[PDB]
Ligand binder design. Structure first.
Ligand SMILES: Nc1cc(I)ccn1
Ligand SMILES: Nc1cc(I)ccn1
Length: 129
C-alpha cells in the first residue's frame, strides 16, 4: 500500500502471550461472523485507505485506527489474551467513525447498524469457562 497510510495495527507478535477463551471463540464464530456478512460491513472490512478516499487528514484525526479486517486477523491468528481486548477493538472502530464523520453521514448510519447488532451479541457473551 501507500507510504502515506500508516502501518496497520499489530496482528502478529510472538512476544505477546496468547490464549484461547470460550468468549474469544464466541467473538469469532458469532460476533465477527454476523457483522462481516452485513450489507453495511464493506467500509469496515479493511483499514481506511486515506489516499484512495482523498482524506488526507484522516490519520491526523484518528490516532487509534481499527477495522474489522484487523480484528478478523487478530481472532483467526490468536492475537488476544481476553475478550475485553477484542471488544475494545470493535468499540474503537465504531468511535473512530463517529469522531471523524458528520452525524447522519451514510457511513455513520452503517456503523450504527453494525453497532446495534454488536451490542445485542455482546450482551449474550457467554460466561467465561
Ligand atoms: N473503499 C472504502 C470506502 C469506504 I466509505 C470505507 C472503506 N473503504
Ligand atoms: N497530500 C495528500 C495526502 C493524502 I493521505 C491524500 C491526498 N493528498
Amino acid at each position: 500500500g501507500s507510504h502515506m497510510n500508516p502501518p496497520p495495527p499489530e496482528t502478529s507478535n510472538p512476544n505477546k502471550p496468547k490464549r484461547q477463551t470460550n468468549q474469544l471463540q464466541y467473538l469469532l464464530r458469532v460476533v465477527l461472523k454476523t457483522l462481516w456478512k452485513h450489507q453495511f460491513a464493506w467500509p469496515f472490512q479493511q483499514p481506511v485507505d486515506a489516499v484512495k478516499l482523498n482524506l488526507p487528514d484522516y490519520y491526523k484525526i484518528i490516532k487509534t485506527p481499527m477495522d474489522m479486517g484487523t480484528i478478523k486477523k487478530r481472532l483467526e491468528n490468536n492475537y488476544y489474551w481476553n475478550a475485553q481486548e477484542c471488544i475494545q477493538d470493535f468499540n474503537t472502530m465504531f468511535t473512530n467513525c463517529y469522531i471523524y464523520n458528520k452525524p447522519g453521514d451514510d457511513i455513520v448510519l452503517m456503523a450504527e447498524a453494525l453497532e446495534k447488532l454488536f451490542l445485542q451479541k455482546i450482551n449474550e457473551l457467554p460466561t467465561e469457562e
